[model samples]
Target chain A: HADTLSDVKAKGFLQCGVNTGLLGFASPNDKGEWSGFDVDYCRAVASAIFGDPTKVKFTPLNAKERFTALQSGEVDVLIRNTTWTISRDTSLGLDFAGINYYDGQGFMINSKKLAGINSALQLSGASICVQAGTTTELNMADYFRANKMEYNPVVFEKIEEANAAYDSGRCDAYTTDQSSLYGVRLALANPDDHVILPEIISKEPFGLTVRQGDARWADVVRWTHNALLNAEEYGITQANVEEMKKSDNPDIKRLLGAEADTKIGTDLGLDKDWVVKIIKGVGNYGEIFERNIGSGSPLKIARGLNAQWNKGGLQYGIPVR
Target chain B: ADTLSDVKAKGFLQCGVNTGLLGFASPNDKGEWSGFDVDYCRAVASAIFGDPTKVKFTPLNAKERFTALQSGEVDVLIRNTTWTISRDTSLGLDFAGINYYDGQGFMINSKKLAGINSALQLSGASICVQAGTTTELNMADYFRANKMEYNPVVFEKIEEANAAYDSGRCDAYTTDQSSLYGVRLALANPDDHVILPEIISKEPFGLTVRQGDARWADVVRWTHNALLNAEEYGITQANVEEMKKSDNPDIKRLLGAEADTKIGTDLGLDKDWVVKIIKGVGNYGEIFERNIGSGSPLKIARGLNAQWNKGGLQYGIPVR
Candidate 1:
């Protein structure tokens, strides 16, 4: 409905979302430039608009404050790990372009606690550690009472404190998502000593967030991500994405803007090279993943649902036009 | 080491995430899920050891995947986003699991009558779409020679206004070709679409839950990973049940079979709950189609489907 190009052109680099502390996803380096999965997202934006990943000012934000930051226009996009909830999406006047990550709640226990415990039902009479003002702690207690399981609660003011307490033997077990478990284990003095339990409790759809009503800005962020995904799906990578630009495939042409597959860009008030900028800026999904969380790193994670559709994963980019 | 029972004794589900849109996160009624934002957070096993939905999945993708670890808003983030530098060292977030290796690209339309060979020629176009996506606002600036004014027809969901483009309401459609084609196919005529010829961006998608609670995130992530590793090790969804009790020590430990650490139950979860997920979700490949752009609905292609070593988008993690 409006043209943000003028405003953005004046501002130059885009203000984007970076991790407040998330490792492989987004973080500031010694040189101060941000890097990681989230950082690359910002880079893609810069590439799409400015033709350079350096054309971005990555900003870090807290989980609770991420939405507020976007609403206040502190950043152009909230590429952070924010959720698309009814309250945030509808009541908060914010719009979520699409889901970037799919998550859920679960608990983790040290491998040493392996004794006749294989289900949450057997967790009765156990002392638990959790953070304050969190749905996890409340849900744990609620589920326990609903299941008629008697237990004690040890609440902490911060996740670090809670995890520290758990590691220092403050409670019988610590509970958090399996992802946190890995982070905790990786942070431990002895990474191999701890273990994440096998329990996924709920569904959480994590998505790139943006200010409400700024549909154009939101679309830029959303499609930038889609650009990465589409590149990966189309066999384009940082190593070969530039060459792949010459692809004869219509879908590739549309994605790369080599051909005027459709004038979707015209509707968005930008040039067709928008896709090219994004791809050139951020590289491919695989490149981003490897640099941040793949076999090359300590968070050594395998591609499961994140793998391409044909590669046994749930994530496959929608073919471009 | 703490038991899940100890944590569940309270009432909290600290989820983790990569913090953005991927696919599985915003799975709609159509059973199609994809994207770098979703899918990675499955670390929060849906089947809470025995009870289900006990753990709450959080939304954390590119921006917050690591911060969520420190903040404790989610249990896990399985979004297929990306990973990178500085994050590994300074961010304090941990990489417990990976489900995808992705890249950035463009998606456009074929109907626009333009001899576009490179980004330089796209200066005079008006792109209609959302804001905050990876596509930058100054793409038209690439060709300084061409006078251009960008006017965006903004919308949140790409599918929304994209539908209008499918209906022949736009001049040039643009996005990552992967999603561009998807938008094109979502239309009545799949043959009318065309992805442009340009590799303009860069990106990678991965998963993250939180930072401090390494033990917790790892368990769920590794468990979900066990499915991938299992599959990589010749394990199939059809044989996961049997693999749960395999003689392989790694498999046994992964499935919580040879060891009775109460790892699953202590978290107020079940050891075999992952089995159910594997059975129900049908591994990474199966979950892709039934939910996101796949054979079932979205029917997306796998141009970069090959593993990292194989010159594709996917890069398998080591399961030690």
Candidate 2:
């Protein structure tokens, strides 16, 4: 628990864990820059201390291996789209930063199969596709068990294969976090042919996972996200950033690196700009979405719970320095 | 416009931007959440796909903004910034964004009897700051024409100025928008500060890119514009969303609920994500007022520029 700084300094760069092929999560380009929401979070850490985003070595991993990667230090932080659950927090010897994505277990079905499927109330005796080693498979099972309904769950070792199986009509439906369902849908040859079921059975607030016992590092990552949200709440972004730094509002200054108020960075032995660098490098919570998932980008999502406090969503930041 | 697909898509997040700044660009966190640099990249990647981690924001100074963007090594750029001449052409970097933060100006101690009311007020003044910045070279040309003589209070890094300026080693400091304000705010006594009333330059800071690649750069640029126009058009933090999918061409598309038809969810992207982003992030004008301007934190009046369209120098993009 000496922190990623100690190990990463020795290793030169930090290895970050991410999804195998989620389009906006952690997919890679030909130049080997692994990108997506998961990838950006990793780079934020690299920028925070190393001052270079490239100091992160992105590793595409699966659900089963994400925890092991952190436990073994294969990666400094698991920016993978992982959910923080009881077993993961307690038994996995890992920790998580603030939630990055809020999702719920759900289903995706091909539009052609439109057999009056409106909600979970109708997913009975139908063959549903699921990835192996994921809570999706378990939740689907539990839902069907509790509802007194039966379902045939087609399985695969990889997410793509499962997505293919469902998309190819090998299964009636595929289930996972609603976001993952969107990932699978985007990869389809004819994306228009499918629909994500409207019902969310279980909650999954994805977060970055780090090794346990190092509360200092954990707090840094957590506050980093908080600072981003706080920046957004305070209307901070790359465009008006210099002005943000000049803010006399104690919290705004601390969040913008005008004042090293967080103590989160100093405690980690990094400069006070940890939060500021993150904002400069990646942006605030609102910026992250607008840049990555908003109108201009491919992910045209609506502001649900991800919206700001005044906007009606649950996304809000703790008071800044 | 075919983009990142499958697991092994090629190319890095081609970024376009500047090199340094303590919190906004170059920060000490040495990790993802170090400072402002952390959020710009995060917002783009996250907004596009609900994941706040898809990026590798490269840091580039103004000089390299053109080449780095053209090469496509980085996907997007959000660094300490300003936009100006020849950048629109000779360099090939297309500006995709702009907001309230701006300008190359001087920061001199009013008590030292620094020049004021105009750039031609005096001669023989000394200015301290970094060399590569536009403020340095521009200040030189400006002073020369005005028949003013000044000493360049050169420093290798921003930190070096502490002792020099504190000990009365230099007469004044020169930098960009509100920066002098920051340096002054952190000074011995925050209240004994005054920024000269004249603006000798135009520094409209924004995101940049390589030429001919308007599709991608347009997305980044328009997204920023969309935010600003959204604010000017009466979209508020409270009402951002209901208007997200409104019939307005720009708002509809910018929110990705209308003109943005096939790009997100259908392209295997998240439809309606932009609406979430607009609702979550608000627009450019909103950000300016809340963070640095008269309303929220910095509490400085927008002078010389930063005024809305019709208000004066600053103007938001039209909602198509």
Candidate 3:
């Protein structure tokens, strides 16, 4: 009864929810132009529907408000930095489409204040800055408890407050997701003054969130991510994709919608060029990762757990027939 | 609105599995179902009834597999069904998740041949394969891609293909490596057969359930994830009771040891549903080892099947 896909088509644009401002993930520039890893995923979905990534509008939501906005139809999809856990996955009236990022909680400290601390284990008996009502706070407490270490947590309701307190030397270390720590470091007064400790105490898999009971919409979002991953796996880049369409590989042919009379795209309520459109818009998963957070970007995160399964990471896309 | 409630009323889960793929699913002389797919069905049955033996298996061949599930002959199909876009969306079904990352491979009788370990050497070789399936198509593709000419000995049924290979009508047989080992074991001399080391195609097999029932999908999907999580957290069948005493929140939430956790109930199950699965069929590692891995007769390596942290692809989604 709830056909969000049709509703989206009728409205002529996708309403995507993103982080208010997290560089390399989802942040806006001075001219209000949006771009980031999460923003690209929203555009990926938009391309699948409208054959144009720019036909979507972005809504920036904070940590606590993203889910409410999603459930109330304020956003078609919430591409926020939200961790997918059982309680939220099942009981929270939300359904996670897929995990685009495999993040983990870690500790970042001012190199000047904690000169000898190279790991989270060394930060024990020291004060740590953490945001309130977050898995980061719980993970920090868990890590300290499991190691039989002592810590003083100075919690802040706002992440900015936590960062400010840590910047002013109110806490010895700031604990959050390792991805966030990289961005958090860039915004600091002295960028080289910090060192993110080499300890990931918790699994923080950020998922693409959607509201419940919309099977078709969920399938679209899920396959949109899969199409990107598959394109990357099969070496379909944005520039070379047109040449790839002429290749003999049946798998590539199907993925790029080059196969004549293929219903693979129509089954998902879209045209045959759905995957082709997504690739041309956002390149592939690896390209998006590299441009946003990998070596090409300022954050320069390693492809540790986010690489393809064949390349020894966990992002295995369901094969395109 | 479908089989979940009726399943409880009947006190057993009707599981559809392969006809007889060793290491995956097969029936013994006494009509006892046992294999990799069998244990998966048992795992879900355990999550539902707290008893692994409460599942009844229906063995279907390749062609009739989907019909069985679509006609409600089986609640879920756990056979070696690949998850592809056409199969996933075109059919009235949804893949729960991939349980095995399989690849097409060739098996040869070393006694019939010598000094050949790779599929590339099978140029001008006769291959016994099943017809009208991905197995035949992939074999053809691999041979053609390698610029080799080969003789094809194909049959409609897999049993015929295996029998034909057994009689030496063909130089080799092709199927997923998971099945190659099983087929090799059933050969006249298991020691004389060697499964070639070339994986021609990816065959990610998963559990299948009727579409549109999101609640039932969660039951089947999370049951598989729970097994993976249990194994990831070191919760074994022999140690689950003691594992409940683990202070780790990851383990605690998965085992329902955390007070008032509705994770299980949220999936329409008791709070300790995961505990029952662990106690029933063991963790994913335990199930793999006992059925197809180091502990089993198949002895398939945990190459791509190992946990995400252990240099493999079996990453468990977080239980909490």
Candidate 4:
């Protein structure tokens, strides 16, 4: 029943809920400024409202605190990589904008310890360390059972415990989300010794979380994602967005708010130049991907399921027209 | 004031569908409606009433479709409607999710028009496009992008446009790629028409409902995700019964076999709502293969509609 758009405008900046610290997804850089893939999405939302990406406050939260923060309206939107589950959607009393990242559970093994061992299939009868009572643990068990490979389970309550267990040779492999595994590898005593398995055993479609009944705010958040994605599809980068405004394509013109037919931004309770502000701040979805997590970034994640729908992936934005 | 409450009060669920699209939604002579969209309606009704037959269809054209949902002429919309920013933002509707990923494609009779393989080659051509929809704009954009000339022969209804192209009034029939195949089946000679390879515009079709009813919207959204997750988990219409007895935690949670699962309680339905959905209409793959997949008359490939793991876009949000 509250107009978050008015409230955020009334206030100074957007209060963004992010992961406490996931290096590639969200963490502070050399200049003490937060920079990562998920942070870029929050910054994009901020830019659309204030026309300045930096006019936002980041409240880093744990996985458990993320939902409650959004639920209590302490944070405007939880841009952390929260998986869109059925219970969380309805039972958890939260709503999702849309999935921005597609991650999955993977095995990170110490390849140096087990010489000539590569695939998870090779870890038969080997002890695997996984955090207890998660889909990650269940997936590992199910995967081994489905493959008819016998393996011992070394379960722990926390990820750090599981990681330390694997590092101390208590288990042959560690498991969690592939993105988290990318971060977990660097903090190891010998980073080059560990190798992530090629297989992705789960589908973790991650995105921003908003409180239920806030349809206006939800629309703004969702359309921001769509606009960023559409920009990528139309070749409207941060560098060329201003110049692209002068282009003749109807779709592009509608996106950049150049054409009079464009009321998409205003209808969502934002400025008509919302898409322009977003592109100028964080660029297109692909630009955000490349800058933070893709081949150019330290994470070096592939655009497997997150690529544009045409390029053999699942990421397709809805139309502007 | 929500749809589910009204449907149970009225003793029948009303779903808006396209007015006689071949594979997506069409009626037989016995006044029996069935297609992918119809099946989706049936699935929703099944979740609500535990019977697929407890539903009715309101056949709407492109222009009438939005108004039909907006005015409560139908409870939900399963028409071949594109999810757009204007319709979504201004029209006060929420597109649950893209159930069908489609794009604008050109169709021509290969028997009469010789050797035109590419849509780019369709310059200075007379194009028959359906009006009051997204296709006309895409057609103009494509022609303009290629710097090609085209005479627009637009019709208000899809049938009119389909007939014009079938009557050879235009050089090409332009519409959504799925509709191209459906229209081809409706043609006088289906084998003669060829759907070109190029997809000019994105037309992601969504199952839509009203904006205010978040609970009902979640019902619609989860219905789709239930279908997809069932298919992904190998829980078919035929096998969903036995899947309830499985040890897999995901399947257990999905089918309400888990101890004190709150899925249906949270979604404001029965504990076995997903079970009813699967048992009634089957999984998404089953529905597709039955209505529009390779087994169907349209024979549309599952390109871009396959599972996220199998090199396509259909990812069911986890049922947990």
TM-score winner among the candidates? Answer: 3
Better of 1 and 2 by DockQ: 1
Q: Per-residue lDDT tens digits of candidate 1, residues A1-321? A: 433545676888788866565566666768886776667776877787778889878777755566677777777777765544433543344555555555455665565655556666666877888766444664576557556779688987655677677777767777654444555567655667565556665435556776544445555665666667778877777667678678765556667767655565544445676777666666787777766777766777666556665575656553343
lDDT of 4 by residue, B1-320 (tens): 47778888998899999889888999999879989899999999988889999988889988888898889989999988898888888887988877898999999999989999999998888899877888888888778867899999988888788888888889899889998889899999999999999988889899999887778888999999999999999999998899998877678879998788788988989998999999999999888988998769988888889988798889898876
Candidates, ranked, lDDT? 3, 4, 2, 1
Candidate 3 regions with alpha-carbon error over 4 angstroms: B113-117, B121-126, B143-154
DockQ order of candidates, top first: 4, 3, 1, 2
Q: List residue ranges in candidate 2 displaced over 4 A.
A: A260-264, B1-320
The global Cα lDDT (0 to 1) of model 1 is 0.55
Q: Write down the C-alpha DockQ for each prediction.
A: 0.02, 0.01, 0.57, 0.64
Error of 1 at B144 (Å): 33
Alpha-carbon deviation at B50 in model 3, angstroms: 1.0
Q: Tell me each candidate's i-RMS in Å.
A: 16.8, 22.6, 1.9, 1.9
Summarize candidate 2's per-residue lDDT along A1-321 as a digit string, tens digits: 265667677778778778888876678888877767667777777777676778877777887777777788777788766775533543455655567766678888877766677776787898988878776776777678657778688888888788778777888888888877766688888888888878887657676787755545665576666667777887888677766788765546655556544453565556767666776777777777765655545766665657774465645454342
Candidate lDDT scores, in order, read 0.55, 0.61, 0.86, 0.86
Off by over 4 Å in 1: A1-6, A113-122, A125-127, A132-135, A151-159, A260-262, B1-320
By DockQ, who's the top model here? 4
Residue-wise C-alpha lDDT for candidate 4, range A21-130, written one tens digit per residue = 67678887666689888999999999988999999999987655677888888999998777778778887668898899888888988888888987878878988887
Candidate that beats the other on TM-score, 1 or 3, i.e. the better one: 3
lDDT of 1 by residue, B103-135 (tens): 444344554544554544545455555554444
| Poorest 10 consecutive residues by lDDT, candidate 3 chain A | A85-94
Looking at candidate 2, what is the lDDT of residue A171?
Answer: 84
